[PDB]
Amino acid sequence: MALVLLSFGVPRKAILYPHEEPSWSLAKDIVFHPYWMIFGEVYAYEIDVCANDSTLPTICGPGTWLTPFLQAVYLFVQYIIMVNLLIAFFNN
């Protein structure tokens, strides 16, 4: 689950925040929103940052249209496959 989390967190941050210098905030940002997604928080108005109803309009930029596709795959794998594998283990 942690590897799946980082496989999404790292590209999301890199695509959406391409002007960053090194900081320990990078560590937080690559884990934080992806973890809360496990529990069904999709951050609906942050998904497409170039939409009119976006709460992150300044983040709109080149390549940012990729991250909804990434998040679509992430939740399918994380929220549906991996959480229910863990639940299947707990059921045994």
Ligand X SMILES: CCCCCCCC/C=C/CCCCCCCC(=O)O[C@@H](COC(=O)CCCCCCCCCCCCCCC)COP(=O)([O-])OCC[N+](C)(C)C
Interface residues with ligand X (CB under 6 A)? 1-3, 5-6, 23-25, 27-28, 30-32, 35, 48, 50-52, 60-63, 65, 68-69, 72
**Site for ligand DU0 contains 77 (CB under 6 A):** no
* C-beta of 26 vs 75, nearer to Ca ion: 75
Q: Does position 87 bind a copy of itself by CB under 8 A?
A: yes
Distances (CA, A) of 52 to 18, 35, 60: 22, 26, 11
What's the rounded Cα separation, in Å, for the pair 32 and 50? 22
